């Protein structure tokens, strides 16, 4: 017997027996593209409207699975390009089973080439990239010597006020007949000093010497780069944004985007829905200049179809001419994957 | 409690004045004082409780109501009407325009009743 448990937004469908099968749906990863419901051979999945699940708050999940129809074949988990559906067999996910088809996609950063500029981290539309970097200590980006002649110094306090980095400290005091001085010491924190020479130039008694200048380690920037495979959607923004061509991406699907600008009424739904940041509303550069109403850059498109699905006036259509997978050994699966071409 | 009184339009007061100032609809929409939930707690009142509003220029009784349009701390809102115009500042500073908005007032709970439209106008001894 097939059963179902709905924990929060998530859905689990289980069949026990000699072979255990569990289909797990994480609502937080679903982009509501609808592909699972199209490929389902028993029409067990019904997907909710893509716009409403993204722009409004809903109590229900993005999809609904009919336990009575689900046979736990896992075509849905095999096609999903957002890693939102997983079929586990005897505790093991089908992504680990070569007999099961797997879409072909990747995203890598060459750490040797990467200079830790953080552009990809900023541009990633799924916040799947983490870039850490260690800058040198400030004191290593300046070289110079500085000394204050504490005898010549009259403790006027002008250097202390004018230091742009508060590197000079004076030990002020109220005089007494036993200590007839307005200060007892002056110091330069050479960890803070950036050797701008302002102090020397303001000093009224020329008490400050300041000048800018063997194997010292050269100061250099270090860092790391991580791509979360569960969040990574393979749009290739990282590959394009990178200034040193350090990021490489490959996509599962090939296809075409077609927009009817005159049908589009610029409600922005598809723009908000697109998990790859393909679609946008350009701003005119000059008063009286007109722009393309709905702009696209297919360099970032993965041809999932969420935008086309979300558009209430059908202004966008998504052609899909190829789905790259590992070997599809079942001819019945092969035809079901081919049913998604258009 | 000393609060700042702001006054002006609401869609419900607009519907009420074009139906009839004589209807109960108008009292329910303009003889009210909108307050933030937290101010009602500190004063010990709930929605529906009546409030005595005293200023330097007069006094009035209005029904307290939670503000669906949140107010800044220390501010209350009474919709435009004869109840609001019991307490706001009349002087025009030689512009002809009275100070209808942002007036220091005292607010306290009261078991007293809200006057309806014909009765409230009686205070002016016509």
């Amino acid at each position: 017997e097939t059963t179902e448990v709905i924990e929060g937004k998530n859905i689990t469908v289980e069949r026990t027996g000699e072979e255990n099968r569990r289909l797990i749906f994480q609502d937080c990863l679903c982009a509501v593209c609808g592909l699972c419901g199209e490929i389902c051979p028993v029409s067990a999945i019904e997907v909710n409207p893509t716009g409403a699940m993204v722009r409004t708050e809903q109590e229900k999940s993005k999809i609904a699975i009919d336990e009575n129809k689900c046979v736990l074949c896992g075509m849905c988990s095999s096609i999903c390009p957002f890693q939102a559906l997983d079929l586990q067999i005897d505790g093991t996910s089908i992504k680990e089973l070569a007999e099961y088809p797997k879409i072909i996609k990747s995203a890598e950063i060459d750490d040797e080439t990467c200079i830790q500029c953080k552009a990809c981290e900023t541009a990633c539309p799924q916040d799947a990239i983490t870039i850490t970097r260690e800058l040198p200590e400030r004191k290593d980006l300046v070289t110079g010597e500085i000394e204050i002649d504490k005898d010549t110094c009259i403790y006027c306090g002008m250097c202390e006020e004018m230091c742009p980095v508060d590197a000079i400290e004076i030990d002020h005091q109220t005089p007494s007949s036993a200590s007839p001085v307005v200060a007892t010491d002056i110091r330069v924190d050479e960890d803070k000093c950036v050797h701008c020479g302002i102090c020397k130039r303001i000093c009224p008694v020329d008490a400050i010497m300041q000048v800018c200048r063997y194997e010292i380690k050269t100061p250099e920037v270090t860092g790391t780069s991580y791509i979360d495979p569960e969040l990574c959607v393979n749009c290739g923004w990282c590959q394009e944004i990178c200034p040193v061509d350090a990021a490489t991406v490959t996509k599962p699907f090939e296809g075409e985007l077609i927009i009817d600008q005159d049908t589009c009424q610029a409600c922005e739904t598809c723009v908000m829905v697109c998990p790859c940041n393909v679609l946008s509303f350009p701003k005119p550069e000059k008063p009286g200049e007109k722009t393309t109403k709905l702009h696209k850059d297919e360099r970032f498109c993965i041809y999932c179809g969420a935008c086309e699905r979300s558009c209430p006036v059908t202004a966008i259509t998504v052609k899909r001419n190829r789905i790259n997978t590992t070997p599809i050994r079942s001819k019945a699966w092969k035809n079901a994957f081919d049913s998604l071409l258009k | 409690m000393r609060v700042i009184l702001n006054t002006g339009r609401t869609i419900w007061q607009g519907q009420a004045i074009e139906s009839g100032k004589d209807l109960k609809m108008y009292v329910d929409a303009a003889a009210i004082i909108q307050m933030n939930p937290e101010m009602m707690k500190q004063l010990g009142i709930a929605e529906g409780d009546n409030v005595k509003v005293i200023s330097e220029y007069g006094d009035v009784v209005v029904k307290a109501v939670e503000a669906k349009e949140p107010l800044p701390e220390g501010m209350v809102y009474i919709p435009m009407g004869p109840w609001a115009n019991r307490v706001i500042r009349p002087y025009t500073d030689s512009t002809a325009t009275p100070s209808f908005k942002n007036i220091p007032v005292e607010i306290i709970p009261t078991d007293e009743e809200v006057l309806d439209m014909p009765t409230l106008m009686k205070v002016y001894g016509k």
């Binding site: 409207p49 716009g51 009424q265 409600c267 209430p312 | -």
Partner: protein, 80 residues
């Protein structure tokens, strides 16, 4: 069964939703331009008798634009 649902008792009849709707806009140049339709046209909803009134819900694509343009939760997409 998510679909459009009005709350006319919360509605100002302000018209934001009617204008923002891409379906309404596509079908009526007047709506597209912020006007209430004067020409007889079949759209999803209008303001009638001072409140939003769903007329042809079969045309709704449940995109949520109208919902996000209303500040008083007088129109929503939910289970029916």
């Amino acid at each position: 069964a998510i679909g459009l649902k009005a709350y006319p008792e919360l509605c100002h009849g302000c018209g934001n939703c009617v204008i923002a709707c891409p379906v309404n806009a596509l079908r009526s140049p007047e709506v597209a331009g912020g006007k209430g339709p004067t020409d007889d046209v079949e759209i999803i909803m209008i303001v009638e008798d001072g409140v939003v009134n769903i007329k042809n819900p079969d045309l709704c694509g449940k995109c949520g634009t109208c919902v996000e343009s209303c500040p008083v939760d007088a129109i929503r997409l939910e289970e029916l």
